[PDB]
């Protein structure tokens, strides 16, 4: 996927 972040 592109154009999307990731938070943990």
């Amino acid at each position, epitope marked *: 996927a*592109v154009g*999307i*972040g*990731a*938070v943990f």
Partner: antibody
Amino acid sequence: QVQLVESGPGVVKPSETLSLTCVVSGGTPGRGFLYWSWVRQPPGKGLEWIGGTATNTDITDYNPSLKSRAAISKDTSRNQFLLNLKPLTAGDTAVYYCTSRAKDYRGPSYSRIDVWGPGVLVTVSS
Amino acid sequence: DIVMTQTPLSLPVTPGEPASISCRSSQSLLDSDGNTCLDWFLQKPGQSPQLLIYDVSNRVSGVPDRFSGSGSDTDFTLKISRVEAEDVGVYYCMQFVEFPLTFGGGTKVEIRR
């Protein structure tokens, strides 16, 4: 990611520069990064992705349809990110939105962060 | 660019009846990790779009179970089992398997009276 606020001139002439600012009010802490995008909507038409950037980097992705007229930047210290457009055509009159997206793994289930500003109408006309 | 085609452009629905919105991509939206990168947004009148369904079939919190999403790699369907007044607005599909991000043309759902 709690709130996005757009600002900028409401009318710009075709030779001038369209400059927009998006101010990000963040939310609960987390590790990782967000992706911030500009999206525009001409009156009565659909959505077009202009470009964007991840918050951790200084590299911007651009829509080729925009003929390298767009310049997008960010400053997490100024909690802002910016759009500059030049030269302009009447075809660039539109509502401009800033957006923030991320996959959210902080909860027990996978979820999404997806926030849009209210948008600002920009009319290009002589 | 990946081309997204959405049908129909305008959908009048009598309250209580089902509605179906179709979307296609010109390429598979399946990415390396096996996820199908297709999201659905709803833009209510006089408001910004917001996320409704993500990764083909996952409902955002607060979205009623009346909304369901299905699809293959290239053909996707948003179904509303019984349409209510709060559902009116423009629905957009969007792919994010590759840059540039591209949207379907939108489907305007309105109340049939």
